[PDB]
């Protein structure tokens, strides 16, 4: 199946002299497995998934040492950015970073990622080729020159093609029981009247894993994309996911509307209708 | 496993 590994960093400045907060979270697909928070007397990376607890003290220390250094360097990066946008020490600012690798059905490197944001918007990103950068403005062009001089792109390409896919392969093996499993959704349709002789059809999808799903409403065999209420995929808490799709439907003395569910856990796509 | 940032990797 299609699998990915991602690290999400946040570097928040404290208003207006305080030590900035560095947080790192590690994901395997949508499953969180590591967390490091700089705000603690003795910060250590913590396991967040059961299948990562088998890893040795050398592994936990390698993570902690990287994240304790990022804490120091991201503090300096927050100072550099403040200077490019002529911002004062008063005011909270944030660097957001996400990087990692994707693998297709075949466990080989598909695509590598390395994106950064300053205060919620795109700042600098590594291109698909993994050898060039996309800078948002003249301030992200200063970062680009520094990174080109430091060969950041080469080293990330070595990491994404190497270490990243190897460790993702390892995590996928040790967590196969929960990570390589596929859980099909439990589907059912609900009907509610919105106003006088006007109804709303809501098709539910529950207990599915992974979160990749598609719910569509077809009127007499045609996709009704804009008229639909496609709610965001939400976690159940039990590591599975849930979603629903709604449509404003007139009574019209007949039923021409059907919902279509497509999920990796289904051997054949489902077609459901309101059964009163 | 995260990546280690070498020297001068700042923004």
């Amino acid at each position, epitope marked *: 199946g299609s699998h990915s590994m991602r690290y999400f960093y946040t570097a928040m400045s404290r208003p207006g002299r305080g030590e900035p907060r560095f947080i790192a979270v590690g994901y395997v697909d949508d499953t969180q497995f590591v967390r490091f928070d700089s705000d603690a007397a003795s910060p250590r990376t913590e396991p967040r998934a059961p299948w990562i607890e088998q890893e040795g003290p050398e592994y936990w220390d*390698r993570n902690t*040492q*990287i994240f304790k*250094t*990022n804490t*120091q360097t991201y503090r*300096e990066s927050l100072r550099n950015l403040r200077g490019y946008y002529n911002q004062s020490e008063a005011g909270s600012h944030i660097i957001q970073r996400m990087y990692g690798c994707d693998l297709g059905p075949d466990g080989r490197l598909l695509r590598g990622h390395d994106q950064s944001a300053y205060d919620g918007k795109d700042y600098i990103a590594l291109n698909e080729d993994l050898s060039s950068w996309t800078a948002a403005d003249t301030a992200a062009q200063i970062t680009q020159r*520094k990174w080109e*001089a*430091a*060969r950041v792109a*080469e*080293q990330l390409r*070595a*990491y994404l093609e*190497g*270490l990243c896919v*190897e460790w993702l392969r390892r995590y996928l093996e040790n967590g196969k029981e929960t990570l390589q499993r596929a859980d099909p959704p439990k589907t059912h349709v609900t009907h509610h009247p919105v106003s006088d002789h006007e109804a709303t059809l809501r098709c539910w999808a529950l207990g599915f894993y992974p979160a990749e799903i598609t719910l569509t409403w077809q009127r007499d065999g045609e996709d009704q994309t804009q008229d639909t209420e496609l709610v965001e995929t939400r976690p159940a808490g039990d590591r599975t996911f849930q979603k629903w799709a709604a449509v404003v439907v007139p009574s019209g003395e007949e039923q021409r509307y059907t919902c279509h569910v497509q999920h990796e856990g289904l051997p054949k796509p489902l077609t459901l209708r309101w059964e009163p | *496993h995260p*990546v*280690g*940032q*070498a*020297d*001068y990797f700042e923004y």
Partner: T-cell receptor
Amino acid sequence: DSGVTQTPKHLITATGQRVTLRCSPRSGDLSVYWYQQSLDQGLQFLIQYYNGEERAKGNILERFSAQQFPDLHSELNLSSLELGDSALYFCASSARSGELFFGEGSRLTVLE
Amino acid sequence: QVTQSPEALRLQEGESSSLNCSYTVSGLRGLFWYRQDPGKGPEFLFTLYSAGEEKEKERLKATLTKKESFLHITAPKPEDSATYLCAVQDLGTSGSRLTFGEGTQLTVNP
């Protein structure tokens, strides 16, 4: 060739004494790496400084200390010297490209 | 982590040989070759980054695989006599610190 300047080049002292080694990185380099080369043994990483602050620690001993100054120069302090502290002490500075440029070294000879 | 072989090379002038360097890292950042003359400090020769990458300067040629690096010396002269150090940087480590091998001490018999 190379640009890193170390001093003193040679030091002779007795056991229980304290010595201080100095290192200036290459012009433009902001890091200082301290290395020890004991006899028969190879180069061992002691400590790294970056733009005035401690950044990484090797197998540096508790009676050894170092510092990087705001003008980027560095000082290695070796206390309560032992015969086994006789070695070559090198420091390096890294270029933005990632390469370490070493100094010529400081030969410490500790006598009883 | 880094082991060099042989610890000592005893070569006749003009007699080519290749110095070995075995390494183990989480992931390779860069592999370095230095030359160290007695008294002086390590002098940079080459940096290799990926498997199959070759670099050449005058009589020296360095090559890299997933497990080792070779420093091939073609027709050595007595002025090639020195200790050859091999060092690696790891991607699972912060900064640019080098972990060195114990070195190959070459002597070229003129």
